[PDB]
């Protein structure tokens, strides 16, 4: 593997030595056995010494196979039998914890593969093979955190702790706990509120989403040893774990019975600390429905202080417990739990790096880890800032680790050859045709040593990746899904936003810098990554930048919400037939807008045409842009805190859609362009209040239609066509010249831009499908549609 | 522990004495053992004398396992075995509830921890380890006070009281029942309802939720001694306990059967009292569902006086029983249970004080206790008058006690040092030399004694708090949630409200004065602490005073409800624009207002624009002012304990949202103020009917936009930026010079003072994030935005 211990490796090498000492050309498992007993009193060796085996005794049996002397050091590698015994030992060390592998596992693995060369050595020398595996097993993997013992005494605690549940305190006597991270100052605030015995219940409110449970392990460690008052002396810390409760329970009544039992034993009161994660669920209050109504027993328990407990809730959760009162107000008392401070995230990362050495490429790159956080919060953006983080780490901490064994030097062709050989070889002997297989057989094995030699020349491709988790890598992986290539995304955001939005640079750079500003990692991710107003007509600019922001901001353009404010009027978007209006603005606020962004805290949220809606909608939007949150949909809190809010506007649209027109000359065209990139910022102001527009980071400017838009419509539609031909394979691109010939059947004055579908269909879809049938084009290679002399032409390229 | 018997402590000191008397110098367990047998006939000592161990006999063995001689009297403290034996005694006293650990427990713990020289002494002197702990065990911990009767009886009473459950009367003939103390005046009307035959069932109505259950123990005591009614000198009080019934059961039918059985045994009729907590659940009447319908058996039982029982009910419950009729109301007959009078509260506080001295603190401070009540009633204000109180007492009654153990005087640096020692020492030996650790090792334990010496110099911070609670502290806990720093809050209310409201002192002092009156004791403890109308167009002062009122009035800035009355007219966001579908005023009375204030009964209620509300609304708010309560949302009563009802008005607007303006004179600005601070207090009255407003006291005055009112808005918006940046960990402040450059792009006449947020976005948000991105300012340093010579400058500080 790359995780083994000395003693293991040492028992193994001793085998090769005995192979040759005994004349065995191929180092049998029999020699692995010798290896084990020849390492003397190693965990394997020692085991063998118990069963009654000396290095010699093994070696004689071993010698009775091939025996002295038929070793010229010819093909002195292991036997396939012996190779199996080793593979088993690695797993036999997973078994005994051990991420590495000890001596024992090698003897244990030997036993497992019990009919081999080894096996026979022990089973001939009067040692039952499993009697040997016993003996090794009962001599540990040799992985510990150190230990000691001295015993305790009887105490009241006996009935309780069985049920339900694990106790942090036990595991901390011989420590194995970690802080882990914090959110340290939160732990302190508990002890006033808990060295209380009448509103003695702390209640942590944050978000999921900070690793709330980290703060909890904090308490455990510090409340035992040793700075705690005599108030909270005679302490036990008990966690009430949900998982054991749900198991073996088929109904609500039985679940309640288990909770009742806990409450009865809870008489250990005021000297016991109970940790209840997700506190809200038990109270069962608020909403259309609850979950379970433990509250009846639980409310007096909190008031009495018999249940002296710690509640872990999120943004939304608390409301449905303090609303019941007043043994929630003579219980609960609040404590500040972050909307992640970036640094706290980072520390979690460092802690779990070595275990992504079981996901190899981590431990390290440290620098990449900080980035894991920093790039992730802003680039996907969806999750919570430490999940976000870690995703970059392990992804990148694997992506390249895949690239490790992709080839030899490209001697993958070698392996391919060795196969083909076997066939020939075989089929020839299968007729027999002895030497007509023989030379093929030889050619096979030629290949074989070579294969393995150059597949392990790509141990150099291992040494590259197998502990770097690389900066660029981490960044790349966030960029891949949906430091370097996210900060190249941030710094070069404008470049990325420019490549998708054509014309109106004015808007792009304004957004670019504002998001990039946020994207430093600083601005605070408790409030959107960007607020914006995106001006421009219904045409060209706005949406496209929002999308392009998904690309630049998030890594790929694979996250852009878009909610219409005209639905937030009550009407103008359920007009006549279309849509469902169930109290319609109430539906949008009350559910729709909040639900969508609650799924994706990620995306560029584009709240469309805030012109047509009344100023009242905007007061609501203003909270979204400022607070970074809105609360609706049964009291749920929606994170707009790393969204990019973009509110669009236009009512002068027509002027930005104004034809180029030959008003006298072709410089009426060049007076139509320049004019429209000016005209926009006043079409914003005219249909609604200013108060909203000021929340916005920057005022983004766009414009559209002229003459010259028709051949741009052809370039939107033809690209949707060719992409639906990509879905089940076919790579197409149209050159602009070919889009022109399509437009040629579209400059009807009497039938508008209707003929464009038909001519795009005719020259692209229809033409490609009727060309795939010819064999002119090739599915899965790149197909360029151009006009050359004057007519449309399909050409092919790789 | 920090609480012990003589006997315990005596066994301990004798160990050190024996260390040297025998040649040792470190007290192992051997000296503790010696301690036990040398303490003579304390329960540990006595035990050892029984099993056959003399003081002599122990000390000689002890001495034969080091002793004679190592004598030179090296520092005699424990060693780790010996420390373990002690840890066990603490738990061996917990075991039998001794909160003042006794002799026995030390021998019990010694045995348990039966290793070290002691163990060997005892196992040498013809006593097995368990034979020794047995002897001790079987004689008390020495912490009793129960029993006072040695009588015996058998009577018909047997089947009933068995089942199900206790006998309050017994425990008060054992000298172990407390009154507790209520709610004393509550108990008396019950005794009428208890000597009857018809109407013989009491039903206590209040809030549950006041510690109501105290009144019940009152009865127990009075049924015993000594002048009480004729059947009350022939009555026994037996408790109907829900907990035993539900235990071992999980079917509703079985619960009913058991209740039927209880009624069968109730044949002690006309001489039996059943105590039923939370009476409603059994009756099952009213609501949209039951809770289990005992009524078939229960109703005739209740009316006849074969079940003469005591009901503990709440705000709503009674209504849903007289509706049931006609044996429900026959049985019932009412008694007044208050949310106890200010004085009643106080007595409860004092009564449970010593056990927050078992929660090692309060014991005292008296001024803080009285305050716990008084301050609670007005400051949070989220329960009934005593529940609040006691919570302050223990919270604060720990908060400073937490500060007890967190430093030496400042000799915390010692502990820090002692660490560094371990390291140098360790790593040096860990490589070796021996002596390359040695002097470092030695330096460590030198340090250690110093460390520990000054950590127990911070027993002085224990003697400070371990009978205190602090005034300021109790007050602090009330400030924490939402005497001294709440009555300093009361006294300095004005100062606190002034520091957070800028513009119109008239308003501030007015709220201050009504609240400070109320907050001194005189004013309803169940109606708003201030009802107010807050005048002037939205922009300056109104909300901000409501907030500032939370800070001064409640002790922290938080908890303020806020409902807009202008929506409640059923025509403004009834379905019109962004709100929710209901027929809006019906929703507000029927649910919204009442539910919201029910969560925090203290909340600053801001009923916005009572002017623009329907005249029915004025009645709804008026009902809060009259009753102090509103009853809605399925008959729940919302306690507006010391809410601050704040009714807003946006009128006066034309002058109060004008331009202060140079009218031809620069004294048109300073007369636009003087005019505006006049114009509001007459503009409120015209927009709504008098019937409401007359039960609204102070007329709170505010304005907004001017020349000058504008520049007060700039400083509100810049402050909205700086707080949202704190969550990640960025400390920002704008000095006035930077707020000025921001104003530079928003003193437009053609766009007003709307641009200011936007100009903050470019010059503050955008500038700081682009300054953080360049790293000239940083997280955890205070960042000043100033203007120097007409240009903005971002600085870094500390």
UniProtKB/Swiss-Prot annotation, chains A, B:
Keyword match Translocase: no
Binding site residues for ATP: 206-213, 536-543
Family per similarity comment: Belongs to the ClpA/ClpB family. ClpC subfamily.
Source organism: Bacillus subtilis (strain 168)
Keyword Transcription regulation included in the entry's annotation: yes
CDD domains found in the cross-reference section: AAA, RecA-like_ClpB_Hsp104-like
Disulfide bonds: none
Keywords noted in UniProt: ATP-binding, Chaperone, Competence, Nucleotide-binding, Repeat, Repressor, Transcription, Transcription regulation
Function: Competence gene repressor; required for cell growth at high temperature. Negative regulator of comK expression. May interact with MecA to negatively regulate comK.
InterPro entries cross-referenced by the UniProt entry: AAA+_ATPase, ATPase_AAA_core, Clp_ATPase_C, Clp_N_dom_sf, Clp_R_dom, ClpA/B, ClpA/B_CS1, ClpA/B_CS2
Annotated region described as Repeat 2, given as residue ranges: 78-142
GO MF terms, alphabetically ordered: ATP binding; ATP hydrolysis activity
Domain of life per record: Bacteria
Biological process (GO), any one: establishment of competence for transformation
Annotated segments matching region I: 161-408
Organismal lineage: Bacteria, Bacillati, Bacillota, Bacilli, Bacillales
Protein name: Negative regulator of genetic competence ClpC/MecB
Spans annotated as Repeat 1: 4-69
Clp R domain segment(s): 1-142
UVR domain mapped to chain residues: 415-450
SUPFAM superfamilies reported in the protein's UniProt record: Double Clp-N motif, P-loop containing nucleoside triphosphate hydrolases
Gene: clpC
UniProt-annotated stretches for the region II: 469-653
């Amino acid at each position: 593997f790359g995780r083994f211990t000395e003693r293991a490796q040492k028992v193994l090498a001793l085998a090769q030595e005995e192979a040759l000492r005994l004349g065995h050309n191929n180092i049998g498992t029999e020699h692995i056995l010798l290896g084990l007993v020849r390492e003397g009193e190693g965990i394997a060796a020692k085991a063998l010494q118990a069963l009654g085996l000396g290095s010699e005794k093994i070696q004689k049996e071993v010698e009775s196979l091939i025996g002295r002397g038929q070793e010229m050091s010819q093909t002195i590698h292991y036997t396939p039998r012996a190779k199996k015994v080793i593979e088993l030992s690695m797993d036999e060390a997973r078994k005994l914890g051990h991420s590495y592998v000890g001596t024992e596992h090698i003897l244990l693995g030997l036993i497992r593969e019990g009919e081999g060369v080894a096996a026979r050595v022990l089973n001939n020398l009067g040692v039952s093979l499993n009697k040997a595996r016993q003996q090794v097993l009962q001599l540990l993997g040799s992985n510990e955190t150190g230990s000691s013992a001295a015993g305790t005494n009887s105490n009241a605690n006996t009935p309780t702790l069985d049920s339900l549940a694990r106790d942090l305190t036990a595991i901390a006597k011989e420590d194995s706990l970690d802080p882990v991270i914090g959110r340290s100052k939160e732990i302190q605030r508990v002890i006033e509120v808990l060295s209380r015995r009448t509103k003695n219940n702390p209640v942590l409110i944050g978000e999921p989403g900070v690793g709330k449970t980290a703060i909890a392990e904090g308490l455990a460690q510090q409340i035992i040893n040793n700075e705690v008052p005599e108030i909270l002396r005679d302490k036990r810390v008990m966690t009430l774990d949900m998982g054991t409760v749900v198991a073996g329970t088929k109904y609500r009544g039985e679940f309640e019975d288990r909770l009742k039992k806990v409450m009865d034993e809870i008489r250990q009161a005021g000297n016991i600390i109970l940790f209840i994660d997700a506190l809200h669920t038990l109270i069962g209050a608020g909403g259309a429905e609850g979950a379970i109504d433990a509250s009846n027993i639980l409310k007096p328990s909190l008031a009495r202080g018999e249940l002296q407990c710690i509640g872990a809730t999120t943004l939304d959760e608390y409301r449905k417990y303090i609303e019941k009162d007043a043994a929630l107000e003579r219980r609960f008392q609040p404590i500040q739990v972050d909307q992640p401070s970036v640094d706290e995230s980072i520390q979690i990362l460092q802690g779990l790096r070595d275990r992504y050495e079981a996901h190899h490429r981590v431990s390290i790159t440290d620098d990449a880890i900080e980035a894991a956080v920093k790039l992730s919060d802003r680039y996907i953006s969806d999750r919570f800032l430490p999940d976000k983080a870690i995703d970059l780490i392990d992804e990148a901490g694997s992506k390249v680790r895949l690239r490790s064994f992709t080839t030899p030097p490209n001697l993958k062709e070698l392996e391919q050859k060795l196969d083909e050989v076997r066939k020939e070889k075989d089929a020839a002997v299968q007729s027999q045709e002895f030497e007509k297989a023989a030379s093929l057989r030889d050619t096979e094995q030629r290949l074989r040593e070579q294969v393995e030699d150059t597949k392990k020349s790509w141990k150099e491709k291992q040494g590259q990746e197998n502990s770097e988790v690389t900066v660029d890598d981490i960044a790349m992986v966030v960029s891949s899904w949906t430091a370097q290539t996210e900060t190249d995304k941030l710094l070069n955001m404008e470049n990325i936003l420019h490549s998708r939005v054509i014309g109106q640079d004015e808007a792009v750079v304004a957004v670019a810098k504002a998001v990039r500003r946020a994207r430093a990692g600083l601005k605070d991710p408790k409030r959107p990554i960007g607020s914006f107003i995106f001006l421009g007509p219904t045409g060209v600019g706005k949406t496209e930048l929002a999308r392009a922001l998904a690309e630049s901001i998030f890594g790929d353009e694979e996250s852009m919400i878009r909610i219409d404010m005209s639905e937030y009027m009550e009407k103008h978007s359920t007009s006549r037939l279309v849509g469902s209006p169930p109290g319609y603005v109430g539906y949008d606020e009350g559910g729709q807008l909040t639900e969508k962004v609650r799924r994706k805290p990620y995306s560029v949220v584009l709240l469309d045409e805030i012109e047509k809606a009344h100023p009242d909608v905007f007061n609501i939007l203003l909270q979204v842009l400022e607070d970074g949150r809105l609360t609706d949909s049964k009291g749920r809190t929606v994170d707009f805190r790393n969204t990019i809010l973009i509110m669009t506007s236009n009512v002068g649209a027509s002027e930005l859609k104004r034809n180029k027109y030959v008003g006298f000359n072709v410089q009426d065209e060049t007076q139509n362009h320049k004019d429209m990139k000016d005209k926009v910022m006043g079409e914003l102001k005219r249909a609604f209040r200013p108060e909203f527009i000021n929340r916005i980071d920057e005022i983004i400017v766009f414009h559209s239609l002229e003459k010259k838009h028709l051949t741009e419509i052809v370039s939107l539609m033809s690209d949707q066509l060719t992409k639906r031909l990509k879905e089940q394979d076919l790579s197409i691109e149209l050159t602009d010249a070919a889009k022109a010939k399509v437009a040629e059947e579209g400059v009807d004055l009497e039938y508008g831009a209707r003929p464009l579908r038909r001519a795009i269909q005719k020259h692209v879809e229809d033409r490609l499908s009727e060309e795939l049938l010819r064999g002119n084009i090739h599915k899965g290679q790149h197909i360029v549609l151009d006009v050359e002399d004057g007519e449309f032409v399909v050409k092919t390229t790789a």
